[PDB]
Symmetry: D2
Subunit: 230 residues, 4 copies
């Protein structure tokens, strides 16, 4: 079973398993039950910005989500990621739909990892995605090319999102993300678009065991990240 650290963008509140009563960002450590959340005033059809940061000094996992000329949502939680995750990881985005649905649409994604024993580094930047985007490991329903974006869940030829969908995008190379100062910054832009009165289920940035894969039946409320609601 995979070991998951994730920052979630949770559009659909599953109160029966812990979610607050509103859309919300939060920090997920080994569980879909967030260890901390904030209210996230999601904006249908609006392109948004997510930034995630962590360093081995403060060991504060932190993230912002915003739309232009609006109040951001902010969440942060103390984690020694070197204690929780393995030496090598992969970095990625995940998303899912259920009974309810939305487009889970990635217009850009960037990452920068620095380790200082002295310094090793990795950086990659996606402002567009192509149909055969060979430096991404695409899993589940994830495609690229159309147009020219990364789409995590299923969406029709005219742009209409489909329920009970799950997909992930992992950058191809593993990342050394702690050694016995270190830091990483992740940035992405997303476009959640839904005809439903309630959209679902949300996007996530995650860091996993190198050989992580979507768990069986992880559509909907489990975001492509988790075996179960535990």
């Amino acid at each position: 079973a995979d070991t998951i650290v994730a920052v979630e963008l949770d559009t659909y509140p599953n109160t029966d398993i812990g979610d607050p009563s509103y859309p919300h960002i939060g920090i997920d450590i080994k569980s879909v039950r967030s260890k901390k959340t904030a209210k996230w005033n999601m904006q249908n059809g609006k392109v948004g910005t997510a930034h995630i940061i962590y360093n081995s000094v403060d060991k504060r996992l932190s993230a912002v989500v915003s739309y232009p000329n609006a109040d951001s949502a902010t969440v942060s939680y103390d984690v020694d990621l070197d204690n929780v995750l393995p030496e090598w990881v992969r970095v990625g985005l995940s998303a899912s739909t259920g009974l309810y649905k939305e487009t889970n649409t990635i217009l850009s994604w960037s990452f920068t990892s620095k380790l200082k024993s002295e310094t090793n580094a990795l950086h990659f930047m996606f402002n567009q995605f192509s149909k055969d985007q060979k430096d991404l490991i695409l899993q589940g329903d994830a495609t690229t090319g159309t147009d020219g974006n990364l789409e995590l869940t299923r969406v029709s030829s005219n742009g209409s999102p489909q329920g009970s969908s799950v997909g992930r995008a992992l950058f191809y190379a593993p990342v050394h993300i702690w050694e016995s100062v270190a830091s990483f910054e992740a940035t992405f832009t997303f476009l959640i678009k839904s005809p439903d009165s309630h959209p679902a289920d949300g996007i996530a940035f995650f860091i996993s065991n190198i050989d992580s894969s979507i768990p069986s039946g992880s559509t909907g409320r489990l975001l492509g990240l988790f075996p179960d609601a535990n």
Copy 2:
């Protein structure tokens, strides 16, 4: 009077004005009396590294100081830099000797400011220093091009440091370091070599962020580290 934010690498305990009784790091917000500090087992004649970090999400100004295969010292303080400094700053290193002295030798320095409204960026890297290093503003006793290093304080033609010295290096361009921001952030690193014949060296190195038009105050040698008008 200049508005100073600083990370200090304090070699000489001046306990008459607040210092703990050991070499320490600390965070300096508008005062030479640190808001917080930690024990910095300084190593004489050893080349060490310093890394300073800050962001507008956590607003926690933090710094590490370390010598190869040894324990680093750590210090961090919660600070909304937008609330203390002006929009435009300049960023710098400073150092000072007094009765006691040391080489305050800079072997490398780097900086990265990111501000996201979207992104504006600033980076500069110094692995060596020429004699006419036109992108620094040298104040007081600071020279460049001996080895290819920045020397914040006075040192002889054969490398021997001198008492009652004070000097500063500042990068030429001013820096946007907060907007009214999705996220802002900066990282600063430098490598130093402190070397002294004294049994106690003094007074320390600082990394500093100031009003653009800041300079060394009158008589800020010693415990005042080139940064502060007074011991208040």
Copy 3:
């Protein structure tokens, strides 16, 4: 008098002084008579891209000028920058109108110096009203739509003729040493040239000069804020 290396987005054919008959890109080495040019189908009112590059191994100053979904214009030229420019320089953008006019809005500017390692990078995506890390010379202003207008624009948003302005980055840039294994720079910028005139004038240039460089008195029109005369 200044030492100027410039790449020029020349919108107005001043054939009297060697311009081709059409709008051109061009490389400018101590003279407004470009040492080399190529043809640039400048699209009026379109945001374009430009990239400028050089290394001390090949010593080829090169430039691309582009509009989404159309063929780029390309120009390149062999010059030892160290034998022309002084050890320290400043970097900038310049623009001029004359009898005819155009807006010279800049939407973005970037730069990277490597000297081999010493390094320098700034990215401007948007410009504030008090953009303190830029030296503004002449008619140049910042803040309006968050951009850099090199030349004067009225409050109707329309361009005034016979104007000249420049933005230089505040920090001096070390652009060659005698002891370099490699040295290199990249410069990139986006612009927008909006003219109600039949023929817009006069163009944009990215430039590297002596640190103390200033707008040559009279440098409007064909002279692009760079050169005192047309020699």
Copy 4:
């Protein structure tokens, strides 16, 4: 059979097959018979620096090899990389010994790819024993002194003859696209060739190939871990 573009640090003159009469650097386009070479005074037991660069505007593959306080060696050649290599590639270092031998230890390695923007950068300043973001192939090991040993070294530190290894970075790299205003890469690395032989052999190269690229069976000695034969 693999598609190979390489810049070769050729320590041994295999004159039988077009090597010059001295150690050289050189650009290898689908052949071990370098298209272009320059003389390189390789210094035994000393750390050196190699820089490799290309952009799609100039279409000029150039390379610099240097030692502190000695004249650099320089080589350069005109190739439209996109007419040679496929859309996607992997990047790497290769090395070989044959009858005579040298250590081929890499102290650091960097790379930057820019596609107009899509980008990729990695910096290796040190190599742990389980360096999972490198594909190791043949005799190559990591960790010992925190370094990358392309070829076999004994437990006394001595270089073994007739050896071959390669380090490819694990992520595919997109090194051209038909819709590129500008694409470019740079690669830097530091090496240390230590040989007790009168004549060290065979050399190090930085290479770009088809993503599925493998060591050619028998590619030791003069063939650098890159080419099936000397054709």
